[PDB]
Amino acid sequence: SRIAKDVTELIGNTPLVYLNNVAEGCVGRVAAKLEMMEPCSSVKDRIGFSMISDAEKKGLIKPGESVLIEPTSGNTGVGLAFTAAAKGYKLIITMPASMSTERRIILLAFGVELVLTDPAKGMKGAIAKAEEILAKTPNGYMLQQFENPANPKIHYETTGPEIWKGTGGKIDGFVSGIGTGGTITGAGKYLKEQNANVKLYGVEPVESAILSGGKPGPHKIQGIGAGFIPSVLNVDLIDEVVQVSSDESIDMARQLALKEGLLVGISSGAAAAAAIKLAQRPENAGKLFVAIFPSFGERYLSTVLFDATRKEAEAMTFEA
């Protein structure tokens, strides 16, 4: 072994683990790619670095000169943040003021310059403020995770290979929750090049299943269901779109912790749920499905993912 030059060399190479008791009834086999083990708990630690790095290399940005700007009340904020911190880049993040406190404490801790927007305008308002800021900023540079090719390209260079080599090339299906689409599109493309028979299953909210003809709407599965088809997503690579409800995902996420000792985010419950359904299809007996667990569940303690246990925790008094 060796010592990392810096935190950025710690990104990727996340572990693969088999789902045991939650996968009851499966004739197929399900392995989870724990992106929750990234330096900052999520898969965005990958694109956070990639998008920055790709700009540097293309000479588009210089530390302490360029001002990174990006609208996101999600994991991309953190990914970029910790990476900007290590590399010495000023980062500005926009997000609806709605987004709970805890989610700001973290970006601030990294020296992020936070700009909250009208909570009623959602991400649409955040995006505006971001471009408005871009216009105002001399050396401003917006990353645009849904447009930026460095997003899927990193998954094609790391995530995909990692899975291929980690499963021994035996992977039959790749289950991925679709947010920007960078993961399913990048990693998917690679796996497909290794084995054309590798099926890619995209996962979206039954409440906002737009890739299935559905109309966009609100759901609770943070991390996915953008309510629109991202530029980086390559729908042609998707072999099947599986839909999961917020409730399913939440129940699964909860089973993953209780039965597997895996404290995952709700979107992980989504992929886990889908992956398992697929693994239960008789024709898939013997097949290896790798589902991606995008984030660790501890960052979502305030969210609905823990409403039950949370109310229980507050309602409990001490025993003498």
Binding site: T72, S73, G74, N75, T76, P96, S98, M99, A120, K121, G122, M123, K124, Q145, G179, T180, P216, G217, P218, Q222, G223, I224, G225, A226, G227
Partner: peptide, 8 residues
């Protein structure tokens, strides 16, 4: 109000 409150 078109729901655009996603967390990505």
């Amino acid at each position: 109000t078109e729901w655009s409150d996603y967390v990505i």
